[PDB]
Structure formats: structure tokens, C-alpha cells
Amino acid sequence: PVARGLSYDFYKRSCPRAEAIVRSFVQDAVRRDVGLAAGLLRLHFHDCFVQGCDASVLLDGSATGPAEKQAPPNLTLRPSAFKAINDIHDRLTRECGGSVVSCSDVLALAARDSVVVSGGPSYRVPLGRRDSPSFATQQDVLAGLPPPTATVPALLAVLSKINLDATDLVALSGGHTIGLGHCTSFEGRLFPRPDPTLNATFAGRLRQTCPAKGTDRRTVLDVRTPNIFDNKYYVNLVNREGLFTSDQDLFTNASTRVIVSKFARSQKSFFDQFTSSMVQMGQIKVLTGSQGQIRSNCSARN
Ligand code: HEM
Numbered sequence: 001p002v003a004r005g006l007s008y009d010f011y012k013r014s015c016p017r018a019e020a021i022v023r024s025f026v027q028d029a030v031r032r033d034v035g036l037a038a039g040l041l042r043l044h045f046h047d048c049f050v051q052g053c054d055a056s057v058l059l060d061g062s063a064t065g066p067a068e069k070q071a072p073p074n075l076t077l078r079p080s081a082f083k084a085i086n087d088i089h090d091r092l093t094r095e096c097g098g099s100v101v102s103c104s105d106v107l108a109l110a111a112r113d114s115v116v117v118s119g120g121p122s123y124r125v126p127l128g129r130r131d132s133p134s135f136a137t138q139q140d141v142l143a144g145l146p147p148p149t150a151t152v153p154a155l156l157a158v159l160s161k162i163n164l165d166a167t168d169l170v171a172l173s174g175g176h177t178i179g180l181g182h183c184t185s186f187e188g189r190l191f192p193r194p195d196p197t198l199n200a201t202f203a204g205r206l207r208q209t210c211p212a213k214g215t216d217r218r219t220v221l222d223v224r225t226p227n228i229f230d231n232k233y234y235v236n237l238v239n240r241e242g243l244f245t246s247d248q249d250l251f252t253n254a255s256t257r258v259i260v261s262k263f264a265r266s267q268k269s270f271f272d273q274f275t276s277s278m279v280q281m282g283q284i285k286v287l288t289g290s291q292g293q294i295r296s297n298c299s300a301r302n
Pocket residue numbers: 035037038039041042045073074075077078146147148149150172173174175176178179180181182183185221244246
């Protein structure tokens with residue numbers, strides 16, 4: 001389903017090359033910056049959960065935006081993803097005129113392309129989002145974004161507000177099949193005692209990277225295939241090798257465990273659900289019609 005105001009053909013007349021421009025850029029950029037794909041995918045999710053899929057977190061004045069200096073490491077996002085959205089927007093501006101394609105639409109398109117260039121399934125992206133001029137505050141971030149220490153009941157409660165369900169939860173967490181995570185996001189599972197749900201061999205390996213509390217290092221989210229979009233994330237879970245509590249508790253909790261097992265056994269079933277759930281996620285509290293603006297410069301208010 002597609003929310004009121006969005007359409008697949010939104011730029012057919014105004015910028016018909018838009019999706020090819022975004023895709024070509026992401027394909028080129030990840031050759032140099034393999035982690036950009038993870039950065040762009042997470043930036044789309046992060047934005048969506050902080051007030052709605054409205055590019056609010058791209059603004060220089062926004063908490064966790066590109067100028068963020070106060071936030072903890074796991075709320076300090078990969079710098080190259082912010083810049084890639086801007087560069088893409090610039091190329092769309094040259095080809096189709098400025099302020100035609102919204103930054104929110106670029107976020108959704110770039111996430112899709114990042115999934116594909118990493119080996120994942122393509123899917124059609126509904127378009128027509130408008131951009132919000134509102135700066136995100138710290139309270140917006142804390143109110144919208146569950147921490148990695150969250151367990152399944154709390155995660156489902158957050159998702160149910162915006163009409164995502166357990167299957168969406170398990171499929172969308174598969175975004176952690178690529179990318180990086182800071183020691184601080186899982187060090188509670190290592191200090192002062194090991195979490196019993198950590199695979200003991202895996203825990204030993206983590207302690208190599210994070211030998212003490214407060215280690216300023218990152219490791220891979222997916223110990224099996226760090227940069228390939230695939231179902232290995234769920235294979236990790238079945239072997240107690242999820243990095244975050246919010247990862248591993250999907251396998252612990254009865255509400256989610258059989259979905260994890262299904263996606264561990266069948267990458268095809270994971271891919272088929274992930275595309276559906278991504279389309280749902282990219283429509284959370286979107287602005288459409290005359291709401292919001294088409295931002296000319298993704299980092300700044302018009
Ligand atoms: C809602 C539950 C979620 C939680 C609690 C969560 C938590 C986290 C944490 C703690 C990090 C690492 C930050 C750091 O330590 O530097 C991370 C990274 C990441 N997340 Fe999630 N996340 C969630 C959902 C998602 C979703 C739905 C997606 C995409 C569909 C996603 C995609 C990513 C990616 C790609 C990264 C790696 C970013 C990079 O390497 O630059 N996450 N997430």
C-alpha cells in the first residue's frame with residue numbers, strides 16, 4: 001500500500017531521470033566507500049524514526065544531524081552518508097532544476113539503492129515526500145529511537161504506534177546485515193559480567209575489540225558477512241551472535257523467534273519481506289501535498 005499523496009510515478013514529468021541519477025551515484029560512491037551503503041540505509045531509517053520520513057535529521061540545526069557534536073557515539077552517524085545525500089541532491093538540481101526532488105525522497109531512494117548495491121533485493125519506492133523545516137531536538141531523538149539495550153516488548157510497542165508489527169520488526173532489523181557498531185552499544189553485555197545469551201566464543205572475540213568499558217572502537221554488526229546484504233544476520237541470531245541486545249532478543253522472545261528462524265533458513269523469504277517492510281517504513285508520518293517544503297539544500301532550511 002501507498003500513503004495518501006505518494007506515488008511511484010511522482011517525478012515522471014518533472015525529473016524522469018531522478019532514480020537513475022541516484023542509483024548511478026550510489027553505485028559509484030560505494031566503490032570507494034564500501035560503508036556508505038550501510039550509512040545511507042541507516043540514515044533513512046534514522047530519519048524516519050525521528051519525527052517521520054521528512055529529512056529533518058539532515059538539517060544543520062537538528063540533533064544527530066551533520067553538525068552533531070554532543071551525542072553519544074551510537075547517535076553520531078557516519079559522516080559520508082550526509083554528504084552523499086547532498087551530492088546526489090546537487091546532481092538532481094543540475095539535471096532537473098533545483099528544489100524539484102525532495103531530500104526525503106532522495107533518502108528513500110538512496111536506501112533502496114544501497115540495499116541493491118550491497119547484494120540485496122530491489123523494490124519500487126513510492127515518492128512525493130515533502131521536507132520538514134523543523135529541527136530535531138534531543139527529545140525527538142530519545143522519544144523516537146529505541147536504544148540497542150531495548151528488548152522485544154518495548155520494540156514492538158514503539159513499532160505498533162506507527163502500525164508496524166512483529167514481522168516488520170524482525171525483517172527491518174535485518175538492516176544490521178551490513179554496517180558497524182560502537183563498543184558502547186553492546187558493552188553492557190560484556191561488563192561487569194557476560195550476558196548469558198552471548199555465544200561465549202563470540203563474547204571472547206568482542207572483548208578483543210572492546211577490552212574495557214568505554215572503548216572508542218567499532219566492530220561489524222554482522223560477524224559473518226559485514227558488507228553483504230543477505231540473511232546472515234539471522235544466522236548469527238540463531239547461533240547467539242547478534243551484536244545488540246535488540247538483535248539477540250529477537251531470537252529469545254517467542255513473539256519474534258520463529259520469524260528469525262524462518263529468515264535464517266530462507267534468504268528468499270527474508271528478502272521478500274524486507275522489501276515490503278522497507279516500503280512501509282519509508283512512509284512513516286510523511287508530509288505530502290502542500291505540507292512542508294521541497295528543500296533546496298538538504299542541510300539547511302529554505
Ligand atoms: C529499531 C530498532 C533498531 C535499533 C535499536 C538499532 C540500533 C542501532 C545501533 C546501536 C547501531 C550502531 C550505532 C553505533 O554504535 O555507532 C545501528 C547501526 C545501523 N543500523 Fe540500526 N537499529 C535499529 C533499526 C534499524 C533499521 C530498521 C535499519 C534499516 C532497515 C537499521 C540499519 C542500520 C545500519 C545499516 C547500521 C550501520 C550504520 C553504519 O555502519 O554507518 N537499523 N543501529
